[PDB]
Write a protein that holds these residues in place. Structure first.
Motif, PDB file in Angstrom:
ATOM      1  N   UNK B   6      -1.393  -2.872   5.586  1.00  0.00           N
ATOM      2  CA  UNK B   6      -0.603  -1.837   6.242  1.00  0.00           C
ATOM      3  C   UNK B   6       0.800  -2.388   6.459  1.00  0.00           C
ATOM      4  N   UNK B   7       1.722  -2.061   5.553  1.00  0.00           N
ATOM      5  CA  UNK B   7       3.059  -2.651   5.554  1.00  0.00           C
ATOM      6  C   UNK B   7       3.995  -1.803   6.408  1.00  0.00           C
ATOM      7  N   UNK B   8       4.347  -2.350   7.573  1.00  0.00           N
ATOM      8  CA  UNK B   8       5.326  -1.700   8.439  1.00  0.00           C
ATOM      9  C   UNK B   8       6.701  -1.619   7.787  1.00  0.00           C
ATOM     10  N   UNK B   9       7.132  -2.696   7.127  1.00  0.00           N
ATOM     11  CA  UNK B   9       8.511  -2.783   6.652  1.00  0.00           C
ATOM     12  C   UNK B   9       8.798  -1.765   5.558  1.00  0.00           C
ATOM     13  N   UNK B  10       7.953  -1.711   4.531  1.00  0.00           N
ATOM     14  CA  UNK B  10       8.144  -0.797   3.416  1.00  0.00           C
ATOM     15  C   UNK B  10       7.515   0.564   3.667  1.00  0.00           C
ATOM     16  N   UNK B  11       6.777   0.716   4.764  1.00  0.00           N
ATOM     17  CA  UNK B  11       6.144   1.979   5.134  1.00  0.00           C
ATOM     18  C   UNK B  11       5.255   2.499   4.005  1.00  0.00           C
ATOM     19  N   UNK B  12       4.378   1.618   3.532  1.00  0.00           N
ATOM     20  CA  UNK B  12       3.458   1.954   2.456  1.00  0.00           C
ATOM     21  C   UNK B  12       2.154   1.206   2.676  1.00  0.00           C
ATOM     22  N   UNK B  13       1.062   1.778   2.177  1.00  0.00           N
ATOM     23  CA  UNK B  13      -0.195   1.053   2.072  1.00  0.00           C
ATOM     24  C   UNK B  13      -0.302   0.446   0.681  1.00  0.00           C
ATOM     25  N   UNK B  14      -0.255  -0.882   0.595  1.00  0.00           N
ATOM     26  CA  UNK B  14      -0.246  -1.537  -0.703  1.00  0.00           C
ATOM     27  C   UNK B  14      -1.363  -2.563  -0.823  1.00  0.00           C
ATOM     28  N   UNK B  15      -1.729  -2.840  -2.075  1.00  0.00           N
ATOM     29  CA  UNK B  15      -2.733  -3.830  -2.437  1.00  0.00           C
ATOM     30  C   UNK B  15      -2.382  -4.395  -3.802  1.00  0.00           C
ATOM     31  N   UNK B  16      -2.407  -5.717  -3.931  1.00  0.00           N
ATOM     32  CA  UNK B  16      -2.108  -6.385  -5.192  1.00  0.00           C
ATOM     33  C   UNK B  16      -3.441  -6.789  -5.813  1.00  0.00           C
ATOM     34  N   UNK B  17      -3.558  -6.608  -7.124  1.00  0.00           N
ATOM     35  CA  UNK B  17      -4.762  -7.031  -7.825  1.00  0.00           C
ATOM     36  C   UNK B  17      -4.650  -8.496  -8.219  1.00  0.00           C
ATOM     37  N   UNK B  18      -5.747  -9.224  -8.068  1.00  0.00           N
ATOM     38  CA  UNK B  18      -5.789 -10.642  -8.374  1.00  0.00           C
ATOM     39  C   UNK B  18      -6.700 -10.889  -9.573  1.00  0.00           C
ATOM     40  N   UNK B  19      -6.817 -12.158  -9.963  1.00  0.00           N
ATOM     41  CA  UNK B  19      -7.687 -12.518 -11.075  1.00  0.00           C
ATOM     42  C   UNK B  19      -9.154 -12.370 -10.698  1.00  0.00           C
ATOM     43  N   UNK B  20      -9.475 -12.557  -9.415  1.00  0.00           N
ATOM     44  CA  UNK B  20     -10.856 -12.451  -8.958  1.00  0.00           C
ATOM     45  C   UNK B  20     -11.403 -11.042  -9.137  1.00  0.00           C
ATOM     46  N   UNK B  21     -10.574 -10.033  -8.862  1.00  0.00           N
ATOM     47  CA  UNK B  21     -11.013  -8.649  -9.008  1.00  0.00           C
ATOM     48  C   UNK B  21     -11.374  -8.336 -10.453  1.00  0.00           C
ATOM     49  N   UNK B  22     -10.627  -8.907 -11.398  1.00  0.00           N
ATOM     50  CA  UNK B  22     -10.829  -8.565 -12.801  1.00  0.00           C
ATOM     51  C   UNK B  22     -12.096  -9.199 -13.359  1.00  0.00           C
ATOM     52  N   UNK B  23     -12.694 -10.136 -12.622  1.00  0.00           N
ATOM     53  CA  UNK B  23     -13.957 -10.726 -13.051  1.00  0.00           C
ATOM     54  C   UNK B  23     -15.113  -9.742 -12.960  1.00  0.00           C
ATOM     55  N   UNK B  24     -14.946  -8.640 -12.236  1.00  0.00           N
ATOM     56  CA  UNK B  24     -15.987  -7.636 -12.079  1.00  0.00           C
ATOM     57  C   UNK B  24     -15.577  -6.318 -12.739  1.00  0.00           C
ATOM     58  N   UNK B  25     -14.519  -6.339 -13.541  1.00  0.00           N
ATOM     59  CA  UNK B  25     -14.022  -5.162 -14.238  1.00  0.00           C
ATOM     60  C   UNK B  25     -14.213  -5.336 -15.737  1.00  0.00           C
ATOM     61  N   UNK B  26     -14.152  -4.218 -16.456  1.00  0.00           N
ATOM     62  CA  UNK B  26     -14.176  -4.222 -17.911  1.00  0.00           C
ATOM     63  C   UNK B  26     -12.969  -3.445 -18.413  1.00  0.00           C
ATOM     64  N   UNK B  27     -12.353  -3.962 -19.473  1.00  0.00           N
ATOM     65  CA  UNK B  27     -11.104  -3.409 -19.989  1.00  0.00           C
ATOM     66  C   UNK B  27     -11.396  -2.087 -20.682  1.00  0.00           C
ATOM     67  N   UNK B  28     -10.876  -0.999 -20.124  1.00  0.00           N
ATOM     68  CA  UNK B  28     -11.033   0.303 -20.738  1.00  0.00           C
ATOM     69  C   UNK B  28     -11.703   1.333 -19.853  1.00  0.00           C
ATOM     70  N   UNK B  29     -12.622   0.892 -18.998  1.00  0.00           N
ATOM     71  CA  UNK B  29     -13.381   1.819 -18.170  1.00  0.00           C
ATOM     72  C   UNK B  29     -12.469   2.556 -17.200  1.00  0.00           C
TER      73      UNK B  29
END
Lengths: 46, 55
Positions: B6-29
């Protein structure tokens, strides 16, 4: 001849004044909503 | 499922994707992105239901 003198009191005069100041500080910003209770999505109907 | 920032400064809800997340993903789905926000009065609410494709 006497030459005899006298003696008085120590009398001194001074003017004393103490002063101060004042400053008003304000912090505000344009309203972008506000802290609300039960912030949930809504579906208005007429 | 990961918490967002919850970013007060930019007034946005943001999330960055990491390498760990992509270990449970498949390219294309075409997954679905669902965003939930909880206020003080404990009220879960779905905000977004966009679909994401990791190509």
């Amino acid at each position: 001849t006497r030459v005899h003198s006298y003696r008085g009191v120590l009398i001194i005069t001074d003017e004393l004044t103490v002063e101060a100041g004042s400053r008003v500080s304000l912090s505000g910003y344009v309203s972008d909503g506000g802290t609300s209770d039960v912030f949930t999505i809504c579906r208005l109907l007429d | 499922q990961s918490p967002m920032t919850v970013n007060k400064e930019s007034n946005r809800l943001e999330y960055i994707f990491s390498q760990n997340d992509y270990k449970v993903l498949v390219k294309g789905k075409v997954y679905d992105m669902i965003v939930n926000v909880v206020d003080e009065s404990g009220n879960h609410s779905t905000i977004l239901k966009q679909k994401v494709r990791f190509n």
